[PDB]
Design a binder for this molecule. Structure first.
Ligand code: NAG
Length: 497
């Protein structure tokens, strides 16, 4: 029930200011009767997920673009939306006073916020850490007797995850991903650079690494936290590049295939955590469908892979059809999940641009393209970063939906936050993407889904500067007459009975 406190920092739009005693928020969900729709709108001009309502009439007065809901045409069901609880995000959140911390967590996970239901958790350190470390740095301890969780986990990440679940509107799913293994298991004996596991799949090195996954899950289970899934490795292709700066662990598609088939798969299966899902790839989509073909065409490996995790750098171009589309065609029964997204890597662009509407549009656009190409989930990177895009021990290069200003006990909600929210808040787990036919060529990006209870949700993004007259038809209800303003994003919701 609290509006956004706008503030400009010289970019295309504003950020919403939050501190220890104030943050913009929503009232509990209130669903209108059949014949009425709810519209949430955000615009570059300043509007932030503002709610309005209107009628769905039997008569059609519009003569422009028409989007027709086709509920009978069913597609993928949604797993959820969320972000990463990296060391950096945790450090930034915990730098605020407790009252502010709660307003930030509520913004993300609460019904008063945008209802995140997914949190990606790095297994030990990555570039968004203030130091390098793994859970077993003590050399040659192949039985992992000295495996343990550091302060980053027990004092920062875990307590914040518990608080998020507590505030959570919906059940939250945890996803774990490792960047590097202890250095004594790597060919190059370093946390980064070009290096992979030593030996070959099946040996003591590969068996210890797989055991590490189990140890990680055990440790977190001791802290009353269970995981929905883990990925086989974060960006496995990065560890094949000479001089790679961040923590990594190289795997060729063939190496991952064998590691999963011979080590990871069996090990997780024979553990008490057998129900945890295993996602392969967890890398850029331009590596598809090749990586998919190499791993999934091997029965011994395929039987352990539940889905394919993909990453994407919004600042770059990548054909979705040749990657996501082709991969779904070749393996229609293996879910596609976006495990990491980020923007601002442009060498000429600042890592953090407070109030950038473009970066927001890149987020919602990416989510729509993903949804239109079978993806069941979209996961952001760092939940929060400081004004310089840190802390990062190597270098700051990406933005974050929420920026924390510790010296002022305040945090800013970027347009990215709201563009993400237009989906995360209104698309609960179990929602199913359905048909939405455009009557003619247009400049809008749109997607329709059906909630588990049968109600409809349609997101419309206008990345152009011109207002677009629009009519949305639901065969069972009628016509919804509206207008998609230039540089705006809308989420429409309505009962179908
Ligand atoms: C920031 O939040 C409110 C809203 O603008 C502002 O009036 C106040 O000065 C700050 N709140 C506190 C006490 O931190």
């Amino acid at each position: 029930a609290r509006p956004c406190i706008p503030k400009s920092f010289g970019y295309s739009s504003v950020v919403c200011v939050c501190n220890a005693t104030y943050c913009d928020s929503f009232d509990p969900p209130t669903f209108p009767a059949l014949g009425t729709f709810s519209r949430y709108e955000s615009t570059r001009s300043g509007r932030r997920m503002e709610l309005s309502m209107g009628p769905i009439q039997a008569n059609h007065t519009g003569t422009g673009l028409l989007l027709t809901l086709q509920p009978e045409q069913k597609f993928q069901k949604v797993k959820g939306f969320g972000g990463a609880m990296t060391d950096a995000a945790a450090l930034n959140i915990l730098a605020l006073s407790p009252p502010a911390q709660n307003l930030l967590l509520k913004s993300y996970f609460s019904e008063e916020g945008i209802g995140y239901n997914i949190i990606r958790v790095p297994m030990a350190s990555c570039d968004f850490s203030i130091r390098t470390y793994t859970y077993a740095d003590t050399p040659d301890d192949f039985q992992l007797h000295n495996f343990s969780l550091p302060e980053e986990d027990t004092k920062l990440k875990i307590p914040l995850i518990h608080r998020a679940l507590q505030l959570a509107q919906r059940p939250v799913s945890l996803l774990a991903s490792p960047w590097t293994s202890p250095t004594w298991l790597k060919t190059n004996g370093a946390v980064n650079g070009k290096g992979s596991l030593k030996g070959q799949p099946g040996d003591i090195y590969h068996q210890t690494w797989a055991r590490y996954f189990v140890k990680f899950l055990d440790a977190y289970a001791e802290h009353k936290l269970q995981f929905w899934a883990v990925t086989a490795e974060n960006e496995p292709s990065a560890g094949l590049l000479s001089g790679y700066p961040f923590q990594c662990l190289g795997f060729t598609p063939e190496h991952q295939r064998d590691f999963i088939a011979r080590d990871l798969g069996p090990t997780l299966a024979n553990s008490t955590h057998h129900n945890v899902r295993l996602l392969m790839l967890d890398d850029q989509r331009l590596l598809l469908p090749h990586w998919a073909k190499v791993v999934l065409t091997d029965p011994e490996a395929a039987k352990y892979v539940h889905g394919i995790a993909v990453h994407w750098y919004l600042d770059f171009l990548a054909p979705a059809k040749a990657t996501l589309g082709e991969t779904h065609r070749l393996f229609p029964n293996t879910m596609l999940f976006a495990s990491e997204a980020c923007v601002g890597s442009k060498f000429w662009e600042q890592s953090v641009r407070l109030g950038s509407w473009d970066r927001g549009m890149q987020y919602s656009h990416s989510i729509i393209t993903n949804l239109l190409y079978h993806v069941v989930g979209w996961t952001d990177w760092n939940l929060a970063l400081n004004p310089e895009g840190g802390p990062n021990w190597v270098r700051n290069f990406v933005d974050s939906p929420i920026i924390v200003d510790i010296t002022k006990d305040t945090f800013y909600k970027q347009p990215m936050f709201y563009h993400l929210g237009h989906f995360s808040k209104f698309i609960p787990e179990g929602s199913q993407r359905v048909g939405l036919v455009a009557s003619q060529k247009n400049d809008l990006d749109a997607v329709a889904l059906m909630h588990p209870d049968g109600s409809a949700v349609v997101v419309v993004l206008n990345r152009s500067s011109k207002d677009v007259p629009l009519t949305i038809k639901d065969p069972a209800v009628g016509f919804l007459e509206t207008i998609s303003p230039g540089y705006s994003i809308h989420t429409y919701l309505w009962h179908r009975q």
